[PDB]
């Protein structure tokens, strides 16, 4: 039961985040003023991992240096990190064949695509994986699933409909649909080869993807055998079910508690608001995992670290978090918004539902509403922003600037409007 090795799929969902991932890697980005990898690594430590693998190619040097600085290079750590260096941008199937050629996989291994934060204890998962593996010999991989946020009427990016067994919890079908975003298609066709073997068919769209896998030694051998499979969910799972090798089984695990994989910007925004709320009971800012963290919980869901500086007669809102070494001026409203470490803030600034990362200076008399700001970027005076307006790295927005809905700004000095240099396309400037 002991000795567990894990593989982390990084360099996987890049450019899915449109203005960012230009200079710095995908997983370096902070959720709550702390890197996304740190959440995943904490999940690994709570699970019980002895050996860690990471997949880096694009901006790999910055990843390796961050692991050097990490809390896991030190000898006392329960796991050791070894990085896989591959050619620039390849599918998950290509990496699977590379790892099988190297041959380090022993018994049961772990694979996670994307960075997932969950409060779900993994010890129960391992036991039920092992109990079901002892049921029949030809059994492959395990999939995690959680109950949806009320109804997925706002959730269009993840339209995965799952057909599941009531008795054995085996997946049958995977399907993506545009539906309310693009009213074009309605039809879903299902294979009738598996009707009387299951009988208790349960079709659900009300389940959130996790893309966290417990996998057997069979998996890397199948990837090398069938090199046509590029994906791990859309084509692979469906391919396994639809009589590729007869008598082979794959798991689908239902859990009542919170487990959401990060993929899009507006999903990231919801997860962040869930983290500011007490949705993830163990995963809260006050517990402090990065060790440098000194966050303290205050009533009405207000988070403050040590060395928080604030000007008198200022109103703070609900579900807010502010980093260390941070200064705030007078006449400020902070409502449902995250502000990073070492961030200097001017005066008369109204913030609602917005986002600001580390080391950011904001000019006086500015209103920011439901819009994101990256690290080491400065805002000028008289700046008005709308919903879903993501601002890139080191972007210096000068005095007197108005930007409408969904006005994305590039992080590199290409195709989209507004760049990094002074007066960003309000008068032609930029490399």
């Amino acid at each position: 039961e002991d000795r567990l090795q894990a593989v982390v799929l990084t360099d996987s969902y890049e450019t899915r985040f449109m203005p960012l991932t230009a200079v710095k890697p995908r997983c370096l980005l902070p959720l709550a003023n702390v890197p996304l990898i740190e959440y995943t690594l904490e999940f690994l430590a709570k699970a019980g991992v002895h050996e860690v693998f990471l997949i880096c190619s694009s901006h790999a040097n910055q990843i390796n240096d961050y692991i050097e600085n990490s809390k896991w290079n030190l000898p006392w750590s329960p796991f050791k990190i070894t990085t896989i260096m591959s050619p620039e941008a390849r599918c998950t199937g290509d990496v699977m064949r590379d790892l099988d050629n190297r041959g380090i996989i022993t018994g049961d291994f772990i694979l996670v695509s994307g960075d997932v934060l969950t409060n779900i204890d993994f010890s129960k998962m391992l036991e039920f994986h092992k109990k079901m593996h002892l049921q029949d010999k030809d059994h492959i991989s395990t999939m995690c699933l959680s109950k949806a946020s009320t109804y997925p009427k706002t959730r269009t990016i993840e339209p995965a409909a799952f057909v599941l067994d009531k008795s054995t919890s085996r997946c049958i079908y995977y399907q993506d649909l545009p539906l309310p975003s693009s009213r074009e298609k309605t039809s879903i066709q299902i294979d009738p080869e598996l009707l009387d073997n299951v009988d208790e068919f349960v079709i659900r769209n009300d389940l959130i993807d996790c893309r966290i896998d417990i996998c057997t030694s069979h998996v890397p051998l199948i990837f090398q055998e069938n090199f046509d499979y590029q994906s791990l969910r859309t084509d692979f799972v469906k391919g396994v079910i639809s009589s590729d090798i007869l008598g082979k089984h794959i798991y689908a695990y239902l859990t009542d508690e919170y487990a959401v994989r990060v993929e899009s910007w507006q999903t990231y925004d919801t997860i962040s608001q869930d983290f500011l709320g007490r949705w993830c009971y163990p995963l809260v800012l006050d517990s402090n995992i990065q060790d440098d963290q000194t966050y303290s919980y205050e009533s009405r869901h207000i988070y403050k670290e040590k060395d928080v500086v604030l000007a008198q007669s200022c109103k703070i809102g609900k579900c807010t978090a502010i980093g260390s070494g941070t200064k705030i001026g007078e006449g400020t409203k902070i409502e449902n918004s995250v502000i990073g470490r070492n961030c200097q803030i001017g005066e008369n600034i109204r913030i609602k539902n917005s986002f600001i990362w580390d080391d950011c200076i904001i000019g006086n008399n500015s209103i920011i509403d439901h819009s994101l700001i990256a690290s080491n970027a400065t805002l000028g005076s008289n700046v008005r922003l709308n919903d879903g307006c993501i601002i890139g790295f080191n972007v210096k927005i000068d005095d007197n600037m108005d930007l409408d809905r969904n006005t994305k700004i590039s992080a590199s000095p290409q195709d989209l409007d507004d760049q990094t240099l002074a007066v960003s396309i309000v008068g032609d400037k930029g490399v």
Partner: protein, 345 residues
């Protein structure tokens, strides 16, 4: 001081740090036991030869341990307890190496008058005595506590979570001469499961069990004889942090009805720290357990807290292994076990 020196020799530091942060370790009694075994491993393994360098290193280790987990007061107290046991024997040792030292009593006033051995063995035995003290508290409680409660008296109980209080209640029910009715507040968001196990163990022993919703506390306060608290941590001013939910209001309800308030605790549970603000000391819960569905949770900003605080204005007795003390005296019991310097680690 960092854990760079203590890594290959001492590994169990970081496993306790892991047990605190993810809350794998549960109940102050257990946290204390672990820190005892930590300090047991620290003395048995290390090489020092010098005494003052050793003590200040222990102080830094305790400082880092409390910064790692703020609700682990039992962690902080146990270290502070051994620190003072060490400091007395060092001050006794320095008097023999130099060569009235006995004025009257054991006072304070450290602002007035100025100032190889088996010391390590004493440090070893000092840990052993602390364990045995934590092992047996109930014997020291029952001789003071089961003298104050009468026949046909109704007992209302917030915090059914404490192992200490339940066992105190079972020893009194063992006495066939004593009869009492037990009211138990549920403590919905956290205590529920523990409150139900509490009601089961009372029925197991055949004691008149009454399960109370957290709304109905007022609707009974006219009929209540006494109130008992299952506290986690006791403080300088008298006040307590208790094992979660629905205590503060019950104590407020008791004081308005002038109903007596009892508290059952240990000296290791007792803390020399001062609660200047409840805002910092109290830990908050998970709102997931209240309300389902996350799209309404955008607008439903729900508030839930685990630990509950009681101000000293309500409770009257803190029955320990030593005896019963008033909240206006408990500071002395604390200073009898922990020194003034051994606070700000």
């Amino acid at each position: 001081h960092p854990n760079a020196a203590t890594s290959d020799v001492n590994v169990t530091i970081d496993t306790f740090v892991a047990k605190l942060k993810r809350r794998q370790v549960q109940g102050s009694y257990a946290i204390a036991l672990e820190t005892l075994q930590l300090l047991m491993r620290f003395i048995s393994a290390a090489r020092w030869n010098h005494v003052n360098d050793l003590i200040e290193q222990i102080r830094d280790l305790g400082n880092s341990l409390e910064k790692a987990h703020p609700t682990a007061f039992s962690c902080g107290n146990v270290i502070r307890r051994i620190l003072a046991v060490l400091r007395d024997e060092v001050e006794e040792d320095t008097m023999s190496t130099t060569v009235v030292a006995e004025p009257l009593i054991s006072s304070m006033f450290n602002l007035l008058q100025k100032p190889k051995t088996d010391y390590r063995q004493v440090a070893i035995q000092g840990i052993k005595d602390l364990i045995d003290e934590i092992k047996n508290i109930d014997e020291g409680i029952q001789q003071i506590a089961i003298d104050l409660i009468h026949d046909h008296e109704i007992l209302l109980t917030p915090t059914p979570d404490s192992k200490t209080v339940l066992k105190f209640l079972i020893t009194a029910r063992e006495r066939s001469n004593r009869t009492f009715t037990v009211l138990v507040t549920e403590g919905f968001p956290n205590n529920t499961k523990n409150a139900h196990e509490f009601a089961k163990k009372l029925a197991q022993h055949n004691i008149e069990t009454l399960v109370v919703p957290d709304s109905a506390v007022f609707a009974l306060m006219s009929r209540v004889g006494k109130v008992i608290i299952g506290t986690k941590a006791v403080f300088v001013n008298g006040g307590t942090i208790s094992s979660n939910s629905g205590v503060s209001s019950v104590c407020e309800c008791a004081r308005e009805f002038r109903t007596p308030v009892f508290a059952v605790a240990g000296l290791y549970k007792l803390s020399p720290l001062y609660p200047f603000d409840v805002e910092k000391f109290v830990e908050f819960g998970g709102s997931q357990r209240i309300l389902p569905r996350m799209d309404p949770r955008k607008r439903l900003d729900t508030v839930n807290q685990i630990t509950d605080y009681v101000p000293p204005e309500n409770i009257d007795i803190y029955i320990t292994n030593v005896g019963g003390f008033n909240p206006s005296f408990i500071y002395r019991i604390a200073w009898d076990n922990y020194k003034q310097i051994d606070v700000h680690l």
